[PDB]
Design a protein around this nucleic acid. Structure first.
Length: 62
RNA sequence: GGUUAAGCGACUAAGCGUACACGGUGGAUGCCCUGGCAGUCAGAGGCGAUGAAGGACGUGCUAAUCUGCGAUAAGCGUCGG
């Protein structure tokens, strides 16, 4: 996914980041409620957030 | 054969002893090595304010401990195998 995400800019990657944070919250609410079933989506979204933050820190200037 | 008298007198085991058979307990002996000990031949001889040694807390689909890791948290990018 990093190859696709490198095309995006600092804005439109922050938007992506915030959207994955919203999705992570919603998955957390379903999971904690005990009505998620697909328990593996939490690993998927967390690693996606880590990827977006890595690309942000790369494009910051360092 | 009957009665009496005299003499002698086996068989008892509440428990115990010894022998043998079979058991219980217990964890020696034998065999074993993912642990150690002593060295040889090579390395390396340091880490730390770019925050160490060592820790607390946390981190999973996780209830706990160990291992790894640090709010990007059993992990993120890139390059090779």
């Amino acid at each position: 996914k990093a190859k696709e995400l490198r095309e995006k800019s600092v804005e439109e990657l922050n938007t992506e980041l915030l959207n994955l944070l919203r999705e992570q919250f919603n998955l957390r609410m379903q999971a904690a409620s005990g009505q998620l079933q697909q328990s593996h989506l939490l690993k998927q979204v967390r690693r996606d957030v880590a990827r977006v933050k890595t690309l942000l820190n790369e494009k910051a200037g360092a």
